[PDB]
Design a protein around this ligand. Structure first.
Ligand SMILES: C=CC1=C(C)[C@@H](Cc2[nH]c(/C=C3N=C(/C=C4\NC(=O)[C@H](C)[C@H]4CC)C(C)=C\3CCC(=O)O)c(CCC(=O)O)c2C)NC1=O
Ligand SMILES: C=CC1=C(C)[C@@H](Cc2[nH]c(/C=C3N=C(/C=C4\NC(=O)[C@H](C)[C@H]4CC)C(C)=C\3CCC(=O)O)c(CCC(=O)O)c2C)NC1=O
Ligand SMILES: C=CC1=C(C)[C@@H](Cc2[nH]c(/C=C3N=C(/C=C4\NC(=O)[C@H](C)[C@H]4CC)C(C)=C\3CCC(=O)O)c(CCC(=O)O)c2C)NC1=O
Ligand SMILES: C=CC1=C(C)[C@@H](Cc2[nH]c(/C=C3N=C(/C=C4\NC(=O)[C@H](C)[C@H]4CC)C(C)=C\3CCC(=O)O)c(CCC(=O)O)c2C)NC1=O
Ligand SMILES: C=CC1=C(C)[C@@H](Cc2[nH]c(/C=C3N=C(/C=C4\NC(=O)[C@H](C)[C@H]4CC)C(C)=C\3CCC(=O)O)c(CCC(=O)O)c2C)NC1=O
Ligand SMILES: C=CC1=C(C)[C@@H](Cc2[nH]c(/C=C3N=C(/C=C4\NC(=O)[C@H](C)[C@H]4CC)C(C)=C\3CCC(=O)O)c(CCC(=O)O)c2C)NC1=O
Ligand SMILES: C=CC1=C(C)[C@@H](Cc2[nH]c(/C=C3N=C(/C=C4\NC(=O)[C@H](C)[C@H]4CC)C(C)=C\3CCC(=O)O)c(CCC(=O)O)c2C)NC1=O
Ligand SMILES: C=CC1=C(C)[C@@H](Cc2[nH]c(/C=C3N=C(/C=C4\NC(=O)[C@H](C)[C@H]4CC)C(C)=C\3CCC(=O)O)c(CCC(=O)O)c2C)NC1=O
Ligand SMILES: C=CC1=C(C)[C@@H](Cc2[nH]c(/C=C3N=C(/C=C4\NC(=O)[C@H](C)[C@H]4CC)C(C)=C\3CCC(=O)O)c(CCC(=O)O)c2C)NC1=O
Ligand SMILES: C=CC1=C(C)[C@@H](Cc2[nH]c(/C=C3N=C(/C=C4\NC(=O)[C@H](C)[C@H]4CC)C(C)=C\3CCC(=O)O)c(CCC(=O)O)c2C)NC1=O
Ligand SMILES: C=CC1=C(C)[C@@H](Cc2[nH]c(/C=C3N=C(/C=C4\NC(=O)[C@H](C)[C@H]4CC)C(C)=C\3CCC(=O)O)c(CCC(=O)O)c2C)NC1=O
Ligand SMILES: C=CC1=C(C)[C@@H](Cc2[nH]c(/C=C3N=C(/C=C4\NC(=O)[C@H](C)[C@H]4CC)C(C)=C\3CCC(=O)O)c(CCC(=O)O)c2C)NC1=O
Ligand SMILES: C=CC1=C(C)[C@@H](Cc2[nH]c(/C=C3N=C(/C=C4\NC(=O)[C@H](C)[C@H]4CC)C(C)=C\3CCC(=O)O)c(CCC(=O)O)c2C)NC1=O
Ligand SMILES: C=CC1=C(C)[C@@H](Cc2[nH]c(/C=C3N=C(/C=C4\NC(=O)[C@H](C)[C@H]4CC)C(C)=C\3CCC(=O)O)c(CCC(=O)O)c2C)NC1=O
Lengths: 248, 20, 109, 177, 164, 177, 177, 164, 164
């Protein structure tokens, strides 16, 4: 839980001033004002949509979700209103496969990649009982969303250091890319789909493109293979005084 | 920046339950 | 130092049974005339043979069973069979209508 | 003499063996209910030429891609080779019904059968379909529920033998799967 | 060009004899395996400007020191000469998948390569890191078929062992 | 996604030309037989949960090694996922029958379907049987050649739609092979 | 994840067997020596902060270029990330010694670890050396042959626990090599 | 699975913690209770043919409508696939007594089971009639000891309440 | 309340958009079927008491094990509740013909239905033995119009495909 990249080599996460404004009885929040407001809305538009580059006649259909956001200052309700939009399903649901839609919900709303096939198949268990709105509100009303983001900050890609699986850090680095990278470049076709269902890992050059500036992006590759052989049984011996002991 | 003693939609509830 | 053809021909002879491709089978015959001393069973061994002639009572009748299926000529579509090679001569009454298919027509009875 | 009925199979040649009238009379009192079991194997092998003629044609009846040009029951001889091996399976099942066990079937007929069909390119997903038609004929002929032909049997119940001859047909289906 | 055809002809031209039954038996293997390595070639041909971009970034990821002032990737006109020289190597693998042997890699990419890269202070380990990245970024049924990847990753393994 | 009218638009947007009357006769005939297309869609969605129950359990009949230990359809969790997949292929084909175009079946259901089933280890020769058992059952109710469940249609030729669905079910079979 | 009792029942599930008295005599000695398994894991977690800092700084001692400009344990930013990582490795092999099966170390910790390290630039030969020091620290606390820190045990052999945990530390080197 | 050991090491893994003293206090209880549930495991292992013979025909005695035509137990192969699907459940009770947790039941035998029995028209009341027969057929000092019967019956009615 | 008119205004509100003349044409088709699905509405609503007298006994004709003491329909107050629980669906099918959509079955009759029949052990095979009677009792020149028998027999097997 130290995480040597997070507030050192990246920026600080954006969001509202505090969460004590909800208990204030003459206001609802520290009132930001329309220069301090819309530059936070620029960071929700760059995160829920990727870099989708939404036009002026596509933002006009999102007029109602901002007008509620500048009165009720909850960030989580703004993210929930933008994921049930037409502009979220015409980019990430309409021409994609099912695990491509699921792997972008982990990117846009959690900042991580899915850790399992069992965690991934339970999101298709919620598709059968309520469609795509049952997937979206179960991510938003989860415990993992509450104890990382809450109502206060935008859901950002967080370098944690103490990931519950090491593979979770790998699939986060494939999902986000560089800053000149959107998420329409594959023709559908989930990137993490082979590695979730089989149990293997990712490619080292695809992860090191998305690492920050100043973190040895790519070195360490020996010129032999990049993954491990599960069938190999090596002999690793320890020197004692007399000989060499192969505690296998 | 999350400040653990905090909620999101029971905060919606009790302002429309103390009036009730 | 090893012989690969000897060492693998012996390994394929003990694992694989000697009895598969020889097409023998126990043919059982029951004889019964009602009485008690008429009731032998004879479990003898015969090499059964591929009967060439009665397959055409199965291969042709199923080829016209599937000719007349309206909904098994779709969802079971056959591949695109090439014609044999005869050489085009130039006259169309030998090229388009050859002597093997001259005046042939189906009669339904 | 049942131990000598495995002697005529193991020599990889033709030998004929039989039991007498007094020998079978000792056999049906030694084994349980053997008059049903000889009635069981007589009901199959009296109709054995129709059983492989209906099952292989019944395999084409729902899968006509085998007689498609490019299939595996095409060109005149593969259909005759398929009808031979349908009759090979029927005589080993009916001997396994007669002897009372599958001990002559799994080692002398199914051992090596899966690797032989994938070497030749035999479609093994359709040969299980041809076995299950022959399974469906066999439980009709044991229980005398065959619609187009009714034999003459002594009265009683034969559903233990029909479950036995169904279970040998899954053992053919389990080896080629 | 080392191929299947030019090997059996030169073995018979050096002996002064006609093409025998064993020389025709090996051209039959050029027919049984042309299907796998030609749809490995047109997959590479249609998607080559996206692969050599991804491969040429793997040498400037591991060996990021090359963009320092003094090294071989010092300015801009030397950076695209690295992407040109990687596109040269991917184009020659497409030729070896067409011909059927290591001929266009031998005669055009490997012979005289170590003398050139040593004289011009080009590290051969970074003409390798772009190639070894393409070899393990290859999924077995997604990018091509099963036997098309066996052929494609064997000419990449040939170039890796020849530069090392 | 696209439908039958929108494919005529996006082919003539590529030529910078207005859709003339020489391209409307494939579309004016589409709304003429458009009532009997809708008449034949709901013969599939009203018999759908019996079709997936038949097509999975007939795939168990032909390949009995799916329910052996280590089979793909072995335990109860793996059995219900196979029943859920055949409902999904039936759901996306019955969008493409309604739309008259195989766009929406191709890029939401078939997009990366082969690379998923390899990674899970789903057998591809058994999963093409379950889309071909229900292919024959989908040309059943269009041609009204069903054994049980006769459905009350209006009289006329529907073999254009019966052949169009058989194009759509082999588009799945060409995608996971 | 699995433990030492769950590993046996997934071996019997491939055969559809029952875990009977032949298979149960390995599990009846896992509970018989089960006091010593608990007695060995609080010999490790009681000394775990001393074990990590000695293994990481003992790797700096045999390789002083890790703390020069250009080493990957150079600043405070990189050295605290190396100290965090060796505590994670020692945590997951204490779970695996407690369970008696190296499942949870192999999927959560070690799966995908080789690709993190060749993207972040972590040297893997010296990282194996920090794991191989704390393998030798772990076998000296279990057999109570450390030079300082004699803990109070009961008398007997724990020589099969010391080589079980040495094989768990050997899987970390085999997965990042 | 889910057991006493996988509970305490995944409760420890989510906190980022080492194995503490409360986690080793739990697996002492796995040592002390093991002689009960490994006697009920190895009694059901060597007697599993006769306890699924008696559980099978108590299903059809209570529900003789299954042997009506068109129903679940129509012919003899469907009787035989009923005795197999209750021999699968007594295998998993033997797996749960050995593991010492409800893990092999709820993900090899209960997960997906309501979905497949609803489609294939199998009634769940016939499945719980078999399992509840074996819970009353157990008697205390003959078939096992008095504490092996508390372990064996508790895994039986966890299966009953999951199907109800 | 899923119908024809809500799904073209809850997909414009979810689009954030005025209704144009594509979802004006979407209820031109609501005019055309309104003469036929309201023909089947009051033909059920004047005949509802006989068509649950004729369908409700057919589950007690099929399943005479329901009347056994200890089973589900063991006294008359359970019989009288059972004819109520199939007259609820014929009330709900009458609403699905009125609204033109599957809404009042989706949220009042099948919403959470699979858990209450499981926990009370009411067999759902006898529920769709009774809707399958009225799917096989209607003769279309006698009972209604020819198009009204399409729409009556579209919402009855919609119950069958949702309850199994
Ligand atoms: C989906 C439900 C929905 C609605 C019904 C509307 C209603 C609405 N309007 C405003 C918000 C507003 N509404 C007005 C409008 C007016 N003020 C005037 O003096 C004029 C008389 C009138 C124009 C006709 C103005 C000026 C604001 C912004 C007030 C401000 O600057 O704080 C807000 C607060 C959100 C915000 O801060 O912008 C809401 C909920 N918007 C919605 O999202
Ligand atoms: C006692 C041992 C014994 C058997 C168990 C059977 C099995 C068997 N069948 C064939 C050989 C064959 N078997 C088939 C059979 C079929 N193809 C189909 O499409 C159907 C699914 C199926 C028939 C219903 C065919 C078509 C051939 C001939 C293959 C060929 O000639 O290319 C061979 C030949 C291999 C060889 O000779 O090297 C063998 C051993 N025959 C035996 O002698
Ligand atoms: C090889 C020669 C040979 C045979 C073919 C059998 C023939 C055979 N079986 C039975 C006698 C019988 N056969 C059957 C069998 C059946 N009854 C049915 O309803 C089923 C259709 C069928 C089971 C497949 C039964 C149930 C009896 C009576 C019980 C018994 O004697 O075993 C009888 C005595 C009948 C009588 O008293 O007239 C004879 C001669 N035994 C032989 O030695
Ligand atoms: C048909 C086969 C064929 C080839 C395979 C290439 C091989 C090749 N590459 C280079 C040339 C080069 N190769 C590189 C590459 C690199 N330098 C770096 O910083 C990294 C090590 C690496 C990036 C990938 C550079 C920078 C040059 C130009 C060297 C120079 O101009 O001094 C040259 C010298 C002439 C030139 O400038 O192009 C040749 C012959 N050319 C061919 O005709
Ligand atoms: C002709 C030359 C040629 C190659 C040498 C390979 C190399 C290659 N692989 C990928 C692309 C990929 N390659 C893989 C790898 C795999 N896919 C899986 O599902 C498996 C688990 C695993 C192989 C075992 C993955 C997952 C991607 C997607 C990466 C991404 O997110 O862009 C790409 C990018 C193009 C794309 O978007 O797909 C390229 C160039 N492909 C080629 O065309
Ligand atoms: C191994 C065991 C085994 C089975 C379970 C069945 C499974 C099965 N059923 C059908 C065949 C069929 N399936 C249906 C579908 C249905 N029937 C109805 O009356 C309902 C409306 C609906 C679900 C109950 C129909 C109507 C046919 C007959 C062929 C057809 O008309 O499509 C087919 C073949 C389709 C073909 O190839 O042409 C198969 C394999 N067969 C088997 O061998
Ligand atoms: C958009 C389209 C779409 C699909 C088609 C399915 C495709 C699909 N199936 C499975 C997952 C699965 N699919 C099967 C299916 C089968 N195994 C067999 O033996 C049969 C051949 C076949 C049924 C007919 C099984 C058994 C699993 C589970 C594998 C496992 O649990 O190990 C998964 C993994 C994640 C998950 O479970 O959701 C996916 C994506 N899902 C989709 O979202
Ligand atoms: C709301 C949903 C909805 C429906 C369910 C249909 C109902 C429907 N089907 C048809 C009408 C028809 N339906 C068929 C179809 C067939 N006749 C056969 O014997 C074949 C088995 C089958 C082929 C698949 C034909 C041939 C017509 C007449 C063509 C036409 O009038 O368009 C008609 C026109 C006149 C009539 O017959 O009633 C209508 C209203 N329309 C709808 O709007
Ligand atoms: C460059 C600097 C440098 C170091 C820091 C040490 C690092 C070091 N420590 C140990 C080895 C050890 N380290 C410990 C750990 C401890 N002992 C205790 O009593 C404490 C409780 C705890 C923290 C100090 C133990 C128990 C051993 C092995 C037993 C032994 O030393 O005999 C070993 C031997 C491992 C092996 O043989 O491969 C090495 C190299 N040595 C060095 O050369
Ligand atoms: C659950 C499994 C699990 C792990 C195994 C670790 C694995 C791990 N280590 C690092 C990250 C790192 N790890 C090291 C470690 C080392 N470098 C060395 O030279 C030494 C040999 C070695 C210490 C023993 C360093 C130096 C970094 C930081 C790299 C940098 O600052 O660029 C990161 C990047 C995340 C971050 O720090 O933000 C991850 C996932 N974390 C996990 O969650
Ligand atoms: C809840 C926490 C918990 C623990 C920490 C352990 C504590 C513990 N260890 C042992 C018991 C023992 N511990 C050892 C171990 C050793 N003796 C040696 O000389 C070796 C150095 C060392 C090997 C690691 C031996 C040999 C026994 C006795 C054998 C046995 O009864 O298992 C005993 C049983 C004897 C007794 O009750 O006094 C207990 C309770 N058990 C627990 O339940
Ligand atoms: C694995 C778990 C397991 C069980 C639960 C039992 C279940 C069981 N009980 C009996 C058989 C019996 N069990 C009993 C015992 C009793 N009957 C009563 O009426 C009393 C309540 C009770 C005394 C405790 C009796 C008296 C018989 C013989 C009569 C019978 O068939 O029930 C049998 C028949 C074989 C035999 O006799 O051993 C079986 C399988 N056996 C097992 O292997
Ligand atoms: C490890 C756990 C495990 C299980 C429990 C079984 C569960 C199970 N049983 C059956 C399958 C079946 N199960 C029955 C069972 C019964 N019929 C009745 O009258 C009673 C309800 C019950 C006997 C007590 C029948 C009749 C079938 C055949 C149904 C069919 O053909 O569709 C099937 C369908 C596929 C098949 O035929 O194999 C499955 C998944 N499989 C497993 O892997
Ligand atoms: C609103 C929904 C609604 C229904 C589904 C039917 C259901 C129904 N059918 C019948 C009763 C009947 N229905 C028919 C009609 C037929 N029987 C056949 O075998 C022919 C195929 C078919 C002609 C279309 C006949 C002949 C009877 C009297 C015989 C009987 O079923 O008892 C009755 C008794 C009173 C009556 O005759 O109406 C009822 C309530 N009636 C309804 O009000």
């Amino acid at each position: 839980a130290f995480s040597s990249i997070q507030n050192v080599l990246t920026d600080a996460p954006l969001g509202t001033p505090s969460a004590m404004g909800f208990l204030d009885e003459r206001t609802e929040k520290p009132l930001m004002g329309p220069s301090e407001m819309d530059e936070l809305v620029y960071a929700v538009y760059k995160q829920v949509f990727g870099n989708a580059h939404i036009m002026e006649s596509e933002r006009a259909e999102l007029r109602d979700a901002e007008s509620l956001f500048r009165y009720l200052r909850d960030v989580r309700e703004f993210v929930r209103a933008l994921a049930k939009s037409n502009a979220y399903t015409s980019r990430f649901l309409q021409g994609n496969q099912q695990y491509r839609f699921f792997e972008l919900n982990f990117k846009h709303l959690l900042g991580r990649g899915p850790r399992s096939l069992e965690e991934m198949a339970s999101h298709s268990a919620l598709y059968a009982e309520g469609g795509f709105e049952a997937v979206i509100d179960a991510i938003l009303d989860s415990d993992e969303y509450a104890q990382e983001f809450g109502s206060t900050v935008v859901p950002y890609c967080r370098f944690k250091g103490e990931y519950p699986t090491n593979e979770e850090f790998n699939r986060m680095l494939v999902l986000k890319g560089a800053n000149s990278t959107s998420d329409k470049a594959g023709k559908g076709r989930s990137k993490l789909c082979y590695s979730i269902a089989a149990g293997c890992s990712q490619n080292w050059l695809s992860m090191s493109k998305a690492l920050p500036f100043g973190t040895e992006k790519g070195t360490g590759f020996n010129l032999i293979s990049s993954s491990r052989n599960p069938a190999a049984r090596p002999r690793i011996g320890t020197k004692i005084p007399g000989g060499v002991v192969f505690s296998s | 920046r999350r400040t653990v003693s905090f909620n999101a939609r029971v905060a919606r509830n009790k302002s429309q339950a103390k009036k009730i | 130092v090893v012989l690969p053809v000897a060492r693998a021909g012996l390994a394929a002879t003990a694992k694989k049974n000697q009895y598969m491709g020889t097409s023998v089978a126990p043919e059982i015959v029951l004889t019964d005339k009602g009485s008690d001393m008429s009731r032998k069973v004879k479990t003898e061994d015969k090499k059964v043979a591929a009967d060439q002639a009665a397959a055409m009572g199965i291969l042709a009748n199923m080829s016209l069973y599937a000719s007349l299926n309206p909904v098994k000529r779709m969802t079971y579509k056959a591949k695109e069979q090439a014609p044999a090679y005869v050489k085009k001569t130039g006259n169309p009454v030998e090229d388009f209508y050859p002597s093997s298919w001259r005046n042939m027509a189906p009669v339904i009875s | 003499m049942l131990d000598a009925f495995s002697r005529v199979v193991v020599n990889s040649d033709a030998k004929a063996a039989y039991v007498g009238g007094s020998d079978l009379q000792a056999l049906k009192s030694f084994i349980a209910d053997g008059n049903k079991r000889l009635d069981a194997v007589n009901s199959i092998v009296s109709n054995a030429s129709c059983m492989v003629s209906d099952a292989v044609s019944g395999m084409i009846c729902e899968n006509p891609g085998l007689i498609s040009p490019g299939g595996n029951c095409y060109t005149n001889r593969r259909m005759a080779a398929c009808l031979r091996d349908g009759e090979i399976i029927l005589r080993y099942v009916s001997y396994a019904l007669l002897a009372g066990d599958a001990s002559v079937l799994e080692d002398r007929c199914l051992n090596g059968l899966k690797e032989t069909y994938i070497a030749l390119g035999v479609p093994t997903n359709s040969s299980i379909r041809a076995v299950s038609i022959m399974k469906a004929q066999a439980v009709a002929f044991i229980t005398n529920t065959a619609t187009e032909r009714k034999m003459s049997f002594a009265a009683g119940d034969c559903t233990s033998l029909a479950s036995e001859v169904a279970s040998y047909f899954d053992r053919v289906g389990a080896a080629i799967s | 060009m080392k191929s299947v055809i030019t090997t059996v002809v030169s073995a018979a031209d050096a002996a002064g004899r006609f093409p025998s039954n064993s020389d025709l038996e090996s051209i039959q293997g050029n027919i049984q395996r042309s299907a796998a390595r030609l749809e490995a070639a047109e997959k590479l041909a249609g998607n080559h400007e996206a692969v050599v971009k991804e491969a040429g970034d793997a040498c400037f990821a591991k060996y990021a020191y090359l963009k320092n002032p003094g090294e071989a990737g010092e300015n801009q006109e030397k950076i695209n000469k690295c992407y040109r020289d990687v596109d040269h190597y991917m184009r020659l693998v497409n030729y070896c998948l067409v011909v059927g042997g290591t001929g266009p890699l031998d005669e055009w990419g490997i012979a005289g390569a170590r003398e050139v890269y040593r004289t011009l202070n080009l590290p051969t380990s970074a003409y390798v890191a772009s190639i070894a990245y393409t070899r393990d970024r290859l999924c077995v049924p997604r990018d091509m078929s099963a036997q098309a990847g066996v052929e494609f990753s064997a000419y990449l393994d040939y170039l890796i062992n020849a530069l090392s």
